[PDB]
Amino acid sequence: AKKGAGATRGVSAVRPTRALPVGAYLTVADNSGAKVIQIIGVVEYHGTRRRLASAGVGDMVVATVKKGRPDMRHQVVRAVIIRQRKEYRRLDGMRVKFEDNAAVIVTPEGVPRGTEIRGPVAREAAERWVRIGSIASIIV
């Protein structure tokens, strides 16, 4: 096998609804230095005519920093969505929804930029990105 302990990506059995289109504002839930980001694209996604790219929990998006430290503003970064307001169904059939739209800034390979994550982290995102779940304090 490859990347036994060094793996960064995992597989999730649940596909959350893509409820956050291009132009949505997300709250950064870690201490990387940014506070509010705006979605400008979604990786590993193909759209169609006149359709905006959308993403949900556990998805990596390209975002621009609107609020944060001066060395982080006006920067193009990659962020993984960890909390969304729109409810989505799990394997047992129950719906789950969160309080806000929150994401964590990571490198393109999936390594988080910050050192700690503030607030609960969705189980799907935790299993999709193992590095995020390692530093997450609350997983739900």
Binding site: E87, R95, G119
Partner: protein, 63 residues
Amino acid sequence: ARWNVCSYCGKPFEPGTGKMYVRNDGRVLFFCSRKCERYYFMGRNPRKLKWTKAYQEARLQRG
């Protein structure tokens, strides 16, 4: 296949239905219906409604 308990009406609801709400502090609530969820979030007192399990506790407290 476990019946959950609504956080507003206090009654169990069947598997495959209902919803789960997560607060920013990690606390988890269960809602059997949009009616219960909306009432809880808008602040309707569940201790004044006879169809709520909290009404029994309220009446016991009042005597």
